[PDB]
Amino acid sequence: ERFPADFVWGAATAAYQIEGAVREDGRGVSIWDTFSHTPGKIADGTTGDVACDSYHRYGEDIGLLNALGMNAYRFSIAWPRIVPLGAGPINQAGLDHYSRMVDALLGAGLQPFVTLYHWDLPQPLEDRLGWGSRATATVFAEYADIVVRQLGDRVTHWATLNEPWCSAMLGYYLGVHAPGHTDLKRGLEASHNLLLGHGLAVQAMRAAAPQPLQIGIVLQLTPTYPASDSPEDVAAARRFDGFVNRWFLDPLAGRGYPQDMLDYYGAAAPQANPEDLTQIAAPLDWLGVNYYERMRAVDAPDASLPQAQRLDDPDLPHTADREVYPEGLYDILLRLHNDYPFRPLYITENGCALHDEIAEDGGIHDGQRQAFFEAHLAQLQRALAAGVPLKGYFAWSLLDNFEWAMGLSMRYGICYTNFETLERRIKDSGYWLRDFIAGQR
Numbered sequence: 001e002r003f004p005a006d007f008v009w010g011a012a013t014a015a016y017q018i019e020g021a022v023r024e025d026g027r028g029v030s031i032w033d034t035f036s037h038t039p040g041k042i043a044d045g046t047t048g049d050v051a052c053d054s055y056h057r058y059g060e061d062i063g064l065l066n067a068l069g070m071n072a073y074r075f076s077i078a079w080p081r082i083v084p085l086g087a088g089p090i091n092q093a094g095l096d097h098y099s100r101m102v103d104a105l106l107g108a109g110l111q112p113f114v115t116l117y118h119w120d121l122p123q124p125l126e127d128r129l130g131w132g133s134r135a136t137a138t139v140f141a142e143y144a145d146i147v148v149r150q151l152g153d154r155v156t157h158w159a160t161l162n163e164p165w166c167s168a169m170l171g172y173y174l175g176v177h178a179p180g181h182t183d184l185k186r187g188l189e190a191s192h193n194l195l196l197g198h199g200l201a202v203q204a205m206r207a208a209a210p211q212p213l214q215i216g217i218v219l220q221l222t223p224t225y226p227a228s229d230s231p232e233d234v235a236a237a238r239r240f241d242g243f244v245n246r247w248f249l250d251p252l253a254g255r256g257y258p259q260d261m262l263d264y265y266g267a268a269a270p271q272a273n274p275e276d277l278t279q280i281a282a283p284l285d286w287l288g289v290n291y292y293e294r295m296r297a298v299d300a301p302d303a304s305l306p307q308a309q310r311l312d313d314p315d316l317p318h319t320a321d322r323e324v325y326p327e328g329l330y331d332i333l334l335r336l337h338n339d340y341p342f343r344p345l346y347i348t349e350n351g352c353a354l355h356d357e358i359a360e361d362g363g364i365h366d367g368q369r370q371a372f373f374e375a376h377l378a379q380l381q382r383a384l385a386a387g388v389p390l391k392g393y394f395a396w397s398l399l400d401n402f403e404w405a406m407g408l409s410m411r412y413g414i415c416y417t418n419f420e421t422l423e424r425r426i427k428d429s430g431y432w433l434r435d436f437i438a439g440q441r
């Protein structure tokens with residue numbers, strides 16, 4: 001029935017998806033400015049140039065969080081605002097902005113859970129190979145140092161990266177995200193330098209921090225299940241689970257990269273000496289899990305790597321873009337708790353997209369998103385019952401925003417955003433979370 005009295009209850013955003021003001025106050029160009037302004041990369045012709053205008057309107061966002069009765073806010077700092085050339089001088093105006101926002105949050109009783117990297121690499125680094133270069137890892141750590149030096153007296157809970165799987169594989173292998181490259185080896189290289197940048201940043205942050213910090217990383221985990229028990233389908237399930245989950249979990253847990261995946265990738269695998277793996281395993285205080293979906297895998301010998309395709313289940317509900325499988329959240333947490341060293345855990349994202357509209361009465365009747373929260377929160381109670389050391393939950397997203405290659409067309413918010421007027425309105429699911437949280441707090 002109940003969560004811990006000190007549980008963290010929040011919603012989450014990322015800077016490029018919400019802030020707009022892309023050229024204001026010294027902000028540099030990010031790979032997502034370049035990519036979103038490249039014809040055809042975004043589905044609907046939109047960019048993050050305005051987005052939710054949260055650079056100017058984070059006060060309104062704070063208003064929503066307050067109305068929701070939350071006690072925490074997960075957001076990202078734009079590297080392009082802080083070090084506009086990527087490696088070079090800081091931009092004090094960038095840091096001052098986030099300093100005021102942090103003060104605003106704390107004054108409202110909202111604990112800032114800051115993400116340092118949620119995909120907006122400065123374009124000057126990409127011009128020197130981006131995550132294809134080990135130098136990018138070094139200058140990421142420098143950036144992590146600068147930020148914590150200035151805001152670490154107030155922010156205790158930091159995440160280095162959000163979802164390196166996406167940054168590496170969507171960004172450099174499949175080409176669907178910025179910067180838009182299409183080479184496996186480049187993707188795997190990028191995964192390594194992300195992980196290294198992570199490890200280097202943790203160490204830098206601990207040395208720069210004016211007080212002890214609780215430092216984590218955020219991974220999206222996709223629990224994977226074989227469509228049948230055939231050696232073929234089981235193998236496919238393993239390969240997918242390795243491609244998405246274990247590739248990151250293992251080296252973070254000090255276990256190296258998974259040998260099966262090393263064998264599968266062959267010459268495409270990155271060059272990973274033992275000093276880098278030691279750095280990548282820098283001790284963490286927590287792990288963030290982003291959870292959206294499962295993968296029910298059939299072998300797909302003719303598809304590209306990892307030769308494993310989703311077997312649709314028409315009995316399960318689907319959202320605008322995903323199948324709903326709440327039981328996967330219990331499953332992956334049970335696996336983390338029993339099989340890996342990370343603890344405590346936070347659900348740093350969970351939510352869904354729907355064809356939301358403002359109805360005649362003025363509300364947004366998103367009952368399927370309410371049912372989505374209710375079901376996933378129920379699985380978290382089960383996970384807690386089994387001893388999973390879960391300390392918080394953040395809904396993705398606080399508000400409808402720029403959904404990457406889908407643009408402004410794919411609405412994930414618990415608040416509706418009118419992108420013309422910038423008015424936000426709380427959806428019915430948001431009111432349900434309010435009332436649920438108020439019962440738990």
Ligand SMILES: OC[C@H]1O[C@@H](O)[C@H](O)[C@@H](O)[C@@H]1O
Nearest residue numbers: 014162163220290396403412
């Ligand atoms: O697609 C929904 C969400 O997925 C997550 O993996 C990312 O961290 C978000 O930035 C994105 O908005």
Ligand code: NA
Nearest residue numbers: 317318319320
């Ligand atoms: Na549906």
